[PDB]
Symmetry: C3
Subunit: 334 residues, 3 copies
């Protein structure tokens, strides 16, 4: 095919956990979908104590934005590494085929840009991440990862082949950080990236994260930034973890339909309490809310959730169903 004969559509990305505009069922034939991301190395405060790290980001956020296309669209990404950064970066799409997912073709030094195109031949949610030869886990675990959703052209389907249509979508990126510690257990204070590298490596080799967070920081998806829904709304939560296994769980709900390893030509698993998303994968869970109130959404290693950061909230509006749950006798002495 002469790709130049296809429609081009430019996407304007949004910051997670929100997701840019798309149509579930494709309203056109295959397109070249044009994306731009600018790499930003920046300081980020990741916990309540004020711990500040040097993060490596796509588009300024941890995770990077969710990109959305349909099966057999072409993804055309312009990747910009401004001269205000100091490191070499690239990008690997798990949705793509060839050249280390794109990484072998997208190495950009500070002051460089590149444009990669690939055909999105398989439907699903997929991780993308930076992967510079010889320093791959350092970039990934500094926050340099996101996800892309490749929808089937006729949208999502249940285990029987009937449509599933979400009303809302959110993207939860989960990040394991390995902040170097001294022997007493305090995070080291690096009076450059090179000077940090060996103890970053040492810290990673412990295999023990210091922080495991959603949307880049402890508490990021809480308070004025809680996720929201109404009773009766159908919500898709895309969840990625580029480096380490996670086990999502909606406290007070379920995953009604879950693609735990994220690939839509497979039937979803029904009625999940908790699912395993392996490190290096994106998964997706669909739920119809049935009760109002606060929900937590967690990695159900509850130490990881409530001590290390892997917990967010939904605030859900609407009527309470006492058939479905009620306090028959409220807590009392007697």
């Amino acid at each position: 095919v002469d790709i130049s004969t296809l429609p081009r559509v430019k996407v304007d990305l949004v910051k997670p956990p929100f997701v840019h505009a798309h149509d579930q069922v494709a309203k056109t034939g295959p397109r070249v979908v044009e994306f731009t991301m600018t790499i930003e190395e920046k300081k980020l405060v990741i916990d309540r104590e004020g711990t500040e790290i040097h993060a490596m980001t796509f588009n300024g956020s941890v995770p990077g934005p969710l990109m959305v296309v349909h099966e057999n669209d072409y993804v055309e990404l312009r990747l910009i590494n401004p001269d205000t950064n100091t490191l070499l970066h690239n990008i690997d799409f798990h949705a793509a085929t060839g050249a280390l997912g794109g990484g072998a073709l997208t190495q950009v030094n500070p002051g460089e840009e590149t444009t990669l195109r690939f055909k999105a031949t398989k439907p699903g949610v997929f991780v993308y991440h930076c992967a510079p030869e010889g320093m791959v886990p350092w970039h990934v675990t500094s926050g340099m990862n996101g996800a892309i959703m490749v929808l089937p052209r006729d949208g999502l389907k249940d285990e029987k082949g009937q449509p599933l249509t979400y009303d809302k979508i959110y993207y939860v990126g989960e990040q394991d950080f390995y902040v170097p510690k001294d022997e007493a257990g305090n995070y080291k204070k690096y009076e450059t990236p090179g000077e940090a590298y060996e103890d970053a490596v040492k810290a990673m080799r412990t295999l023990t994260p210091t922080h495991i967070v959603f949307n880049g920081a402890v508490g990021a998806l809480t308070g004025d930034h809680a996720l929201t829904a109404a009773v009766g709304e159908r919500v898709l939560v895309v969840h990625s973890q580029a480096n380490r296994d996670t086990r999502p769980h909606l406290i007070g709900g379920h995953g009604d339909y879950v693609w735990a390893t994220g690939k839509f030509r497979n039937p979803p698993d029904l009625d999940q309490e908790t699912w395993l998303i392996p490190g290096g994968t994106a998964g997706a869970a669909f739920y119809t809310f049935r009760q109002p109130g606060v929900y937590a959404y967690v990695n159900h290693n509850l130490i990881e959730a409530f001590e290390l950061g892997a917990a967010g909230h939904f605030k859900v509006t609407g009527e309470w169903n006492d058939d479905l749950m009620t306090s028959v006798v409220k807590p009392a002495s007697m």
Copy 2:
């Protein structure tokens, strides 16, 4: 519906790994199934060395008892926190919808009780656990978790829709403990719960269990308390892990039909050697024994099994099948 028009049936629970009486296929219409549990904080010796912890239990056991209902029954639990305890507790059912699984409605101080009702709208095995705001993983990893089985009204089915009927059921609760250690590696000796809390938190944040046990202690499901079966019996083993992934395996057998993430509207996986039950989940495996003798049942991280405690035994009675396995030449010099 006027729930007061429905039959009530009172269940009398039993200590794991045994399971209270139920009928696989529902012999009545939907019911309100009434359960009572009394919280008990108590000392438990968890290993061969005599290490004693302060456990937090439902009904005196780690795990708490297995509760069994059918889909679209109502579970009505009276939860009692006697004044001989010292902490606040509650309960979250992963089977339930709303109010953090029940936790937001069931906070009981010592000297209080409460009664919660919920509709068991999804079939499967599910975790339940205590979850007091701000101290969730401490209670869970002190043993305060169990499981509930919500059977389909027409019992279990294989991947083709034909019945699967078990002759015996067992409930294996797997518990990760985080006993605080001093710098030399010995378990700290807490001359109160408050004085323990910070190092309990420190110990949990290592993400490294000190003990991983079935039925509350190293060796609990061995000797006079080995699980039993006969050749030709169909056995369902429900296995839960409220906080951490496990990978069960029957040494010398298989999971003929396994719902690894526990939800019965999905077809089972066939012929498993080993399955992954994510932390925060219950799973169920069905097996028909074909050979007599001793079997081990383990978490197949074999360090976790044989060094940290996650191993039990079956003793199986009956005839040996030499077609299926035989020693052609017994060990010898020659």
Copy 3:
């Protein structure tokens, strides 16, 4: 059945990652398939630094060779423990039924041999490993494990029941080692096995591998020993991990059809980016290559891959498809 009436066929094993000759679709009726393995305790250098361990091997390799039979063949293994070894060993097949997978029938001291037969009643890839009572994880994590593939008699099938036929097969055994460390972090230097045992136990109880390798060493499946394929070839990669979870990923490709937990009566999962193989399991992934060049094949905990050793390479020959992926604008300043 009088097993003596069946054909006997002797298999001559090969060193991983290669796999001995077999036919996907069975060309005969059920057979007694005869295998011989000789246990070898030997020193192995496992990393670039020259760290040398005392490995415990089947047939001289880590992993042990892949054995291949068909469903309802009999596997007859002669297991030899020469008097040049010093330890007791045995073998447990996860494919087998009874006697702890064979371990209870195959205990051989140095200078002994034994012959075990079992019926391979379930199709799939399965772990085998040594398991001497009281020292199981030490032998497994010293390298004493491999896998066996029990093919359906009519070969592999996709999720719709149509044939899947591989052109090439490779066996990747992934090994977690726990080399004991002193307080400063250097590997201890054991001026016997008995003298090593307690700190081997200590090291394992950390649950933190020092090395996680494919084919027995860092870099073993790279350079002159990279895996190979051509564009358009169908490749099956069998992957085992006898003790610890892994999450394989082909960097630049996919698992087109994946049996993550390895059992062929189940439909494969399609289009996987990354799969979870639980510790104690073998899995299998089928992929048709579409692009030439270098691929990495990794455990996608990228710390485990690129710092601890769990990475190999494919070198793929053929034509590059610019429709599927191209650099539209190569990296440049502008």
